[PDB]
Amino acid sequence: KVFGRCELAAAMKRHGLDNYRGYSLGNWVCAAKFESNFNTQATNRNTDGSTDYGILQINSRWWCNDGRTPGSRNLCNIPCSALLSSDITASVNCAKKIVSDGNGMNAWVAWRNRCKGTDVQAWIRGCRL
């Protein structure tokens, strides 16, 4: 499922991401835009034989089982395909354990490179929230 900016903003707020670990909604929308283009089905092979899955491009090295990621961890205790659903519950709940682990949203390269230190409130501007 491909979300619009404000449609995902509202879905993410609905799932309790707004100021989760002090990260305002704009931060999550910005990350989602530059990670997946708001597409729950987005997959991208990483450098090391891992793959990134879903709206927040969660990585198989650490966070889920895709049955091809070397000597792998499943820290969110899901198959990576669960993250591609039109229902974003799995991606949101896993993202909460990622951002909580101590590095915050720096886990997302797109966030660190494109959202961090920018006017992230632009991302929810004109959105019914």
Ligand code: NA
């Ligand atoms: Na894995």
